[PDB]
Amino acid sequence: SKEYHIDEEVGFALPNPQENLPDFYNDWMFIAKHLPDLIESGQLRERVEKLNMLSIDHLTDHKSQRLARLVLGCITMAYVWGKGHGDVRKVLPRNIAVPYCQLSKKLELPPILVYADCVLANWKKKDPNKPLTYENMDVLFSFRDGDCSKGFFLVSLLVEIAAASAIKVIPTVFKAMQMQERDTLLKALLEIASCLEKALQVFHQIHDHVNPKAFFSVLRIYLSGWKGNPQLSDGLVYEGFWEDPKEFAGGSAGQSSVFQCFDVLLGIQQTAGGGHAAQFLQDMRRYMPPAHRNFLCSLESNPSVREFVLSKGDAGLREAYDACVKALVSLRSYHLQIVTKYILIPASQQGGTDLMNFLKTVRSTTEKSLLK
Amino acid sequence: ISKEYHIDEEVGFALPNPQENLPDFYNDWMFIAKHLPDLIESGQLRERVEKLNMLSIDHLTDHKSQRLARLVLGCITMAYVWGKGHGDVRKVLPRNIAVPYCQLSKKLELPPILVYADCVLANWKKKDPNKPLTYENMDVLFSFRDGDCSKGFFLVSLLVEIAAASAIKVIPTVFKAMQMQERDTLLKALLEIASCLEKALQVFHQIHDHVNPKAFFSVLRIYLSGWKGNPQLSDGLVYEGFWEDPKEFAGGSAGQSSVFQCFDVLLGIQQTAGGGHAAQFLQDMRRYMPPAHRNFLCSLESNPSVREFVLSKGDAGLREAYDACVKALVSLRSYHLQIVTKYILIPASQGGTDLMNFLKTVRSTTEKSLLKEG
Ligand code: HEM
Ligand code: HEM
Ligand SMILES: Clc1cccc(-c2cnn[nH]2)c1CCc1ccccc1
Ligand SMILES: Clc1cccc(-c2cnn[nH]2)c1CCc1ccccc1
C-alpha cells in the first residue's frame, strides 16, 4: 500500500490522533470537551451562538484538521439535537457553520459527524507504552453521561484495528496471483481468514461496555443525520455557506472502509445491482476519507481473486477462499444479533424490519459467494 | 493507458471492431434482433420472444461476443417491454430471455437494461474495413423501427466519442508531466486535449443531417426509455426466473458516457462532488458503464489535481491552455443545450424543465471552473 493513509498497526484508523488544538481554538475545545454538562444544564445552544467565527488556516497538518472535524462535528450534533428529546435546531449558526463547511471541503468530507471522525480519529491510549486493548484506551469526546459512547466507539475501533492485520496481506495476495505462486496465495488467504475470525471475538466485548437502553434512547439520537429524516425533512441550513438547507446522512459503520474493503478483495459484489443495499454502500463511500476511497477504487481495478481461484481446480485454494467468505458471513451474522438486542428489542419497549432486511441482504450476498 | 481499463488508442471507450454475428447456437436471438422493425410493425415480436427456448450463455466465450449478445438481448428486451411504441406495455420479461440476459448482465457487471455501452459503443461496423471511421463508411448493427433515426443518433454519438478519444491517450502525459515537473510538456498536452475537444464539437454538428426531431422524440426516445421512476412500470420490471420481485433500472443516457465525465474529473470540475441531483445522477450513471471504465474514472479521481497545479505556478501560458480545455467543455455543453431545445423541447410543444435545469447546472459548474474569463 502507498499513500492510501493505511497504517500497519491500526489500518484505516488514524494513528495517535491529536488530542489538543492550537490555542486559537480554545472556544471550540471548551464546548466540545464539556458537552455532557453543557447539554444537561441547557447552556450549550447559547454558547454555540455566542461563538465568534474562527478561521481554519491555523490548522496546518492533517491530524489537526481531523481533530477539528471531530470537535466541530460533535458540537453540531449537540446543537442540532439539544438534550435529545426531540427539540431540533434547523439552522446551524454561521459562526460555526462556515469553518465547519470550509474545513470539510478541504478534507473532501461532508459537513456532519462521520465514522472517520467519531471512531477513527476519536481515541487515545491511556498508557503509551502498553498495548491497544480496551482497558488501556479511552475516547476523546462524549455527548452525555451514560451515553455509552466510549464503549460503542472503542469496540467499533478495536474491530476496525483487528481487521488491519488482514489488510497488509492484500498486497501479497495480488503478487501471488500475478507470479502464479499457489502456495504463497493459499497462505495469504488462510491468514486473512484468521484475522477476520479474530475480529469476531473482539466483537463480543460490545455486550460488556454498551447498554441497549442507553444506546437506543441516547447515543443513537446524537449520531443521527438529516437525510430522509422526518424531523429535518429538508436538511440543515448551513448559515452563511449554503443558500438552502442540505441533506447529509448520519454516521454508519457502512462508512467503515474495512468491511467494504474485503467484499471488494473477494469479489462479493455488494455494490452490484440497483438495490437499496448496493446504493447505500456506494453512497457511504462519499463519507470516507478520500485516501480510503482511492484505496477501494484501486482494489476494484485489480484482477479478481475469486476468478483466479475458481479457474484452478484446486480444493486447497477454494477452501482458503471460502474461509474468508465464511468469516465475513460469521461477522454479519453475529452483527444481526447485536442489532436485535440493541435496536429491535429496545424499540419494542417504548417499521425497522427494513433495517434487518438491509443487513440480511448484505449477509446473503456474502453467503452466495461461497465457492463449494 | 493500462490496457486493463479497456481504452483503445484509436477508438477510446468504444468497443473496437465489434462482433456482428453470434454462434449459430444463438440464431433465434439473432433473428429477432435483426428484424425488430419488421416484427414490431407486424405485431409478431412478442409472440416470437414468448416462443423462445431458454438458451445457455455458456457458449458466449470471448468478451466481444458477450457484448454483442448483451446488445441483442437489450434491443429485444426494449422491443418486448415497449411494443409498437404507444403504451401497450409488458411488465414481465419472459424467463427464457430474462434468465440468460441477467446471467450475462451479472457476468459483465452491467444492469440488465439497454445501456449506452450497448447501443453506441458496441453497435457499429465499418462498411469498408480499409477506409476511415467516417459516417459514410459506418453502419449500426441494430435499430428499433424503420425511420427511427437510430443510425444517425447512435453513429453521431459514436463519432463524437471517437473524436474525444484522441484526447484520452494524452491523459498519462499530463500526470507524468506534473510529476516530473515538466512545464513545457504539460502545456503541449493541455493544448492538445483542448484541440481534440474542439474537434469533437464539430463532429457533433452532423446530428442535424441524420436525425429528424419528430423521429427522435416520438420513436427513438420511446424505445430507449427505462423503468425507474417511470409510471408506465411504476414498480419496475419482473425478470421472471431470476428475481422474484420487479427491479428498477434507468434507461440509456449520454450521462453514461465515460468521455465527458472523464475530462471533468481530469480538470477538477466537480460535477460529482456535492449532494445535489446532477451530482447524484452522474454518480449513479457510473454504475451503467463497463466496469473497466468506471475503474478508469475513479482512478483519475485518485491522482493529484491539474487545476491546483496550474493554479500554483503564476504561468499564464499554462492557465490559458488549462482554460482552453474548460472552454471546449462549455462550448460542447452549450451547443448541446441548443440541440436538446431542437430535439426535445420544441417537439414536446406539439414538466420537462428537469433536463434543462440538469444541463445548465452541469454547464454552469464547468463555466465556473474557468481560471479567467471576466
Ligand atoms: C450496538 C451496536 C451496533 C448497532 C446497533 C449497529 C447497527 C447497525 C445497523 C442498523 C446497520 C444497518 C445499516 C444502517 O442502517 O446504518 C449496521 C451496518 C453495519 N454495521 Fe453495525 N451496529 C452495531 C455495532 C457494530 C460494530 C461495533 C461494528 C464494527 C465495525 C459494525 C459494523 C457494521 C458494518 C460494516 C455495517 C455495514 C453493513 C455491512 O457491511 O455488513 N456494527 N449496523
Ligand atoms: C437529439 C440528440 C440529443 C438529445 C435529445 C439529448 C438529450 C439529453 C438530455 C435530455 C440530457 C439530460 C440528462 C437526461 O435527462 O438524460 C442529456 C445529457 C447529456 N448529453 Fe445529450 N442529447 C442529445 C445528443 C447528445 C450527444 C450526441 C452527446 C455526445 C455524444 C450528448 C452528450 C450528453 C452528456 C455528456 C450528457 C450528460 C451531461 C453532460 O455531461 O453534459 N448528447 N442529453
Ligand atoms: Cl456513528 C457510528 C460509529 C461507529 C459505528 C456505527 C455503526 C454500527 N453499526 N452501524 N453503524 C456508527 C453509526 C451508528 C448508528 C447505527 C444505527 C442507528 C443509529 C446510529
Ligand atoms: Cl440511449 C443513448 C445513446 C446515445 C446518446 C444518448 C443521449 C444523448 N443525450 N443524452 N443521452 C442516449 C440516451 C438518449 C435519450 C435522451 C433523452 C431521453 C431519452 C433517451
Author numbering:
A (entry chain B): 12 to 361, 380 to 401
B (entry chain A): 11 to 360, 380 to 403
The authors write:
Expression of IDO1 in cancer cells results in the suppression of an immune response, and therefore IDO1 inhibitors have been developed for use in anti-cancer immunotherapy.
Here, we resolve one new X-ray structure of a previously reported triazole extending to pocket B (13, MMG-0472), which validates our docking predictions. Here, we proceeded to test this compound in the enzymatic assay and found it to be one of the most potent azoles with B pocket extension with an enzymatic IC50 value of 14 µM and a LE of 0.33 kcal/mol/HA. The 2Fo–Fc map of the IDO1 bound ligand clearly shows its electron density in both pockets A and B. The ligand is non-planar, with the central bond between the triazole ring and the chloro-phenyl displaying a dihedral angle of 39°. This deviation probably reflects some strain in the complex. The resolved ligand structure is very close to our docking prediction with a root-mean-square distance (RMSD) of 0.3 Å. As it can be appreciated from the top view and superimposition with the X-ray structures of triazoles 9, 11 and 12, the phenyl ring in compound 13 is rotated away from Ser167 and towards pocket B by about 20° with respect to the phenyl rings of the other compounds.
